[PDB]
Amino acid sequence: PTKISILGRESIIADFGLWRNYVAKDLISDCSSTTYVLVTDTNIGSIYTPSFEEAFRKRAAEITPSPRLLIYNRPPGEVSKSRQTKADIEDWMLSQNPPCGRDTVVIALGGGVIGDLTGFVASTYMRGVRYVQVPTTLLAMVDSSIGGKTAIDTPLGKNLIGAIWQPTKIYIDLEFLETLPVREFINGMAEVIKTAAISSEEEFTALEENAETILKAVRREVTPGEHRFEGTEEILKARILASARHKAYVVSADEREGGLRNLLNWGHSIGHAIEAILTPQILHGECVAIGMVKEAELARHLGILKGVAVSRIVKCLAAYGLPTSLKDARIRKLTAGKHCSVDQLMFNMALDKKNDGPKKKIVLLSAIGTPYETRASVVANEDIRVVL
Amino acid sequence: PTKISILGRESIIADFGLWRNYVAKDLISDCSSTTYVLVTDTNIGSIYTPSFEEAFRKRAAEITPSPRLLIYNRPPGEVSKSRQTKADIEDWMLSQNPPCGRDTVVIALGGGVIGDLTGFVASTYMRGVRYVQVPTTLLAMVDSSIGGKTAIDTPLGKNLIGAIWQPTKIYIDLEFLETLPVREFINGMAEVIKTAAISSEEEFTALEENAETILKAVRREVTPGEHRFEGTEEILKARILASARHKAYVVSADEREGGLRNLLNWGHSIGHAIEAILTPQILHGECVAIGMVKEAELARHLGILKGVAVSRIVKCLAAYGLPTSLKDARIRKLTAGKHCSVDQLMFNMALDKKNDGPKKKIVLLSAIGTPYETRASVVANEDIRVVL
Numbered sequence: 001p002t003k004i005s006i007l008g009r010e011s012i013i014a015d016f017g018l019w020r021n022y023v024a025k026d027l028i029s030d031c032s033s034t035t036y037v038l039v040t041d042t043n044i045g046s047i048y049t050p051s052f053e054e055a056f057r058k059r060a061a062e063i064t065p066s067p068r069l070l071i072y073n074r075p076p077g078e079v080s081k082s083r084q085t086k087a088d089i090e091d092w093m094l095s096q097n098p099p100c101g102r103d104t105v106v107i108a109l110g111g112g113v114i115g116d117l118t119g120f121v122a123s124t125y126m127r128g129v130r131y132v133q134v135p136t137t138l139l140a141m142v143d144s145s146i147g148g149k150t151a152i153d154t155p156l157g158k159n160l161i162g163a164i165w166q167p168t169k170i171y172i173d174l175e176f177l178e179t180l181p182v183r184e185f186i187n188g189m190a191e192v193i194k195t196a197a198i199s200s201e202e203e204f205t206a207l208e209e210n211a212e213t214i215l216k217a218v219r220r221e222v223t224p225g226e227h228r229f230e231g232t233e234e235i236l237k238a239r240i241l242a243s244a245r246h247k248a249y250v251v252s253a254d255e256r257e258g259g260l261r262n263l264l265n266w267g268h269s270i271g272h273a274i275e276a277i278l279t280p281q282i283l284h285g286e287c288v289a290i291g292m293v294k295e296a297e298l299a300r301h302l303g304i305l306k307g308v309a310v311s312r313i314v315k316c317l318a319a320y321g322l323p324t325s326l327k328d329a330r331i332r333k334l335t336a337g338k339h340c341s342v343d344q345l346m347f348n349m350a351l352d353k354k355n356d357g358p359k360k361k362i363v364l365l366s367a368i369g370t371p372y373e374t375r376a377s378v379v380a381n382e383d384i385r386v387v388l
Numbered sequence: 389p390t391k392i393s394i395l396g397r398e399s400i401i402a403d404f405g406l407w408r409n410y411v412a413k414d415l416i417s418d419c420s421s422t423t424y425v426l427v428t429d430t431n432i433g434s435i436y437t438p439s440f441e442e443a444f445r446k447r448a449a450e451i452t453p454s455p456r457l458l459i460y461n462r463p464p465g466e467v468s469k470s471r472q473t474k475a476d477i478e479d480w481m482l483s484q485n486p487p488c489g490r491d492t493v494v495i496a497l498g499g500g501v502i503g504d505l506t507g508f509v510a511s512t513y514m515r516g517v518r519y520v521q522v523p524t525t526l527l528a529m530v531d532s533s534i535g536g537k538t539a540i541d542t543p544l545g546k547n548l549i550g551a552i553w554q555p556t557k558i559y560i561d562l563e564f565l566e567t568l569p570v571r572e573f574i575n576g577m578a579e580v581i582k583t584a585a586i587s588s589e590e591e592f593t594a595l596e597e598n599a600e601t602i603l604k605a606v607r608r609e610v611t612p613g614e615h616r617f618e619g620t621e622e623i624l625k626a627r628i629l630a631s632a633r634h635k636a637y638v639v640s641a642d643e644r645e646g647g648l649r650n651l652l653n654w655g656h657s658i659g660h661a662i663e664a665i666l667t668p669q670i671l672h673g674e675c676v677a678i679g680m681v682k683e684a685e686l687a688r689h690l691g692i693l694k695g696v697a698v699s700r701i702v703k704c705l706a707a708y709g710l711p712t713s714l715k716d717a718r719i720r721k722l723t724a725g726k727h728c729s730v731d732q733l734m735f736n737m738a739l740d741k742k743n744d745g746p747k748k749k750i751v752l753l754s755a756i757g758t759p760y761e762t763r764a765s766v767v768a769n770e771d772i773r774v775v776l
């Protein structure tokens with residue numbers, strides 16, 4: 001079992017089968033409380049909550065008095081990361097008998113949507129309650145669940161309202177990947193690739209080599225019993241952990257994005273601008289993949305990044321089934337009639353939280369695994385437009 | 389020009405005439421930014437924002453590139469502390485040209501409503517922006533503005549959702565009191581009295597000695613534009629400062645209310661339960677005054693507080709024009725047909741943020757200026773019912 005520390009605390013426990021046999025117990029011993037609220041959507045719930053309710057009663061039978069478990073299920077989709085859902089969830093908790101108090105321990109069981117949402121609710125519930133992350137997707141395991149960033153979407157853009165609330169525990173259970181849809185898995189690989197590109201050429205090269213093997217396992221059939229990733233697990237764990245460990249480091253050194261944390265946003269300046277236009281038809285990771293390509297092209301444009309690097313980024317993202325341009329085949333049919341104007345994209349980048357005033361900040365890599373600055377660089381509009 | 393230090397920083401500056409000739413300048417020097425957002429209601433705005441716009445341009449004229457000042461006027465009343473107003477202010481900020489970014493400095497110009505609201509918006513705007521407090525009401529000057537506690541109301545109770553976001557600066561300008569309605573001033577005295585009752589019998593005695601004088605300066609009939617509190621200001625400043633300084637201390641020693649900070653909630657366990665029923669017809673301070681009386685009666689019931697003390701708290705609150713019972717004359721006609729059932733009050737105390745699980749907690753004074761515990765004490769329902 002791997003333990004990664006973040007911000008002076010060992011909130012990260014990684015292993016296989018945690019959900020089934022560890023989270024239930026650990027929660028009741030390290031997160032003493034009379035109330036526990038489980039948040040997840042209908043898809044993840046029907047598959048994973050049942051087993052937990054039992055694991056819960058079992059470990060709560062021994063504690064006096066016995067705490068309680070309350071399960072909230074919301075409509076799966078990047079459409080629940082909103083004000084209304086966060087409102088219903090809060091009201092719901094408040095209507096409970098007895099109500100859910102400041103000792104409430106909230107459990108985020110899901111990907112980035114449920115994670116971002118659950119964590120935000122927890123940050124403002126009665127001004128703050130404890131919560132834990134149980135990332136069930138790849139993207140949430142290698143990125144979203146770590147770091148304490150949470151938020152919701154408003155009609156204008158992505159993650160415009162939120163809070164930096166660190167979760168008390170973060171349980172990374174690789175077993176969840178067994179049931180994660182193919183698209184989702186690829187989608188999350190965008191983040192893994194991104195994390196490697198800003199940290200080490202070694203890790204990136206590793207990811208390039210793992211391509212075929214990893215991709216062949218994800219597409220595999222699997223019969224009720226054996227686990228996909230049969231014979232590729234050591235590789236998987238190694239890659240996932242590398243991503244998680246690096247994020248932990250960055251977050252530790254600059255929790256509130258005073259500068260260094262900007263780097264975790266590589267590909268997101270353009271990615272988010274695009275995502276605000278093509279969501280929900282297009283997933284986060286898929287948009288970020290295209291954003292990494294355009295931001296990379298921008299770095300070459302500025303004479304910061306070498307062309308050979310731009311091509312290698314594209315080839316790597318392509319090798320994982322990720323799109324590398326807004327003209328991509330799949331992405332074309334999925335939008336149906338949606339297209340990004342250079343104007344809209346520029347309008348949305350004005351909304352980039354990294355911006356310092358009206359100065360747009362984008363992460364520029366000077367080379368694979370080597371950022372240009374230890375923060376986002378100020379870039380002029382005209383230069384952005386050229387790659388759009 | 390007095391300065392108080394809170395949570396390791398002298399963010400509190402108190403004097404007369406700060407708004408007119410200081411806030412403007414200090415903001416531009418200590419809160420460097422390209423964007424400043426002023427939030428206030430129509431009542432306080434028409435009286436106080438004009439003078440500031442001028443003071444602003446004046447001190448921003450030397451600054452290049454020119455920074456901007458955007459203004460948001462919400463409707464007066466507790467009605468503004470809602471999920472919607474917070475969503476309106478937010479969608480507004482996000483909609484300016486260019487959008488309000490993470491360098492935005494938000495200015496809270498108002499009492500507890502505008503303070504709690506503005507501060508909460510700031511806490512979650514793009515995950516957190518800077519903000520300052522310009523308390524225009526007595527209550528806010530002596531309590532709500534200091535401490536970082538911010539929140540909004542939901543159909544179920546008071547301050548159920550919010551955040552602990554410390555303001556960068558807190559400007560206490562006594563000049564605002566000149567135009568504060570009589571009811572408001574009295575309303576805030578409830579907090580002053582409360583702060584003294586949990587800190588010192590000395591301060592609490594000077595309060596008793598100043599009732600006649602303070603209240604006479606307050607009730608005096610004046611024409612628009614002329615002042616009061618003439619020949620009593622040294623007294624006023626002294627009392628206000630004492631309350632602010634004490635809150636500063638408490639908040640510093642237990643920022644996120646884990647223990648100590650419970651004491652600042654004396655009279656609020658019952659006060660909030662009542663306020664959730666009689667609002668908005670009844671003001672916070674007026675509800676807290678009745679809450680202090682009943683909580684004190686409760687302390688005597690438990691054999692913690694001496695009867696002579698309870699009858700001194702009553703006499704003091706009465707001396708300020710504050711109610712001491714739900715049967716009060718003014719409070720009877722103001723509710724019109726509203727009355728608090730004992731079962732209802734109990735229900736509303738279930739939602740009290742201080743409760744450890746289902747265990748209601750209340751602040752018990754063992755004597756004037758001396759709490760029973762350095763935190764809220766656990767009290768049984770049956771004992772609460774007896775003072776209801």
Ligand SMILES: Nc1ncnc2c1ncn2[C@@H]1O[C@H](COP(=O)(O)OP(=O)(O)O)[C@@H](O)[C@H]1O
Pocket residue numbers: 041042043044047076077078110111112113114136137138139140144176177178179180181184187188284
């Ligand atoms: N372990 C899992 N197995 C099955 N369905 C899952 C799993 N993880 C999440 N899902 C479903 O996958 C979809 C995408 O997850 P989401 O949290 O929105 O994305 P991400 O984590 O990529 O931000 C959702 O419809 C959700 O219900």
Ligand SMILES: Nc1ncnc2c1ncn2[C@@H]1O[C@H](COP(=O)(O)OP(=O)(O)O)[C@@H](O)[C@H]1O
Pocket residue numbers: 429431432435464465466498499500501502524525526527528532564565566567568569572575576672
């Ligand atoms: N100094 C002032 N002069 C004029 N009206 C004021 C002043 N301060 C605020 N007000 C008005 O006082 C009322 C009560 O203030 P509010 O912030 O709602 O409560 P409090 O500060 O007592 O919690 C509001 O209607 C507001 O518009």
Ligand SMILES: O=C(O)[C@]1(O)C[C@H](CP(=O)(O)O)[C@@H](O)[C@H](O)C1
Pocket residue numbers: 143144146147149151158159191261264265268353
């Ligand atoms: O700081 C972080 O953890 C992130 O940059 C945070 C972003 C979301 P944000 O740009 O809204 O902060 C997330 O999508 C990215 O994968 C990681």
Ligand SMILES: O=C(O)[C@]1(O)C[C@H](CP(=O)(O)O)[C@@H](O)[C@H](O)C1
Pocket residue numbers: 531532534535537546547579645649652653656741
């Ligand atoms: O801790 C505080 O600052 C307070 O207890 C905060 C409360 C509001 P809360 O009980 O909703 O936290 C306020 O009414 C009181 O005067 C002071």
Ligand SMILES: [Cl-]
Pocket residue numbers: 124512
């Ligand atoms: Cl919110």
Ligand SMILES: [Zn+2]
Pocket residue numbers: 191268284288
């Ligand atoms: Zn991302």
Ligand SMILES: [Zn+2]
Pocket residue numbers: 531579656672676
């Ligand atoms: Zn109060």
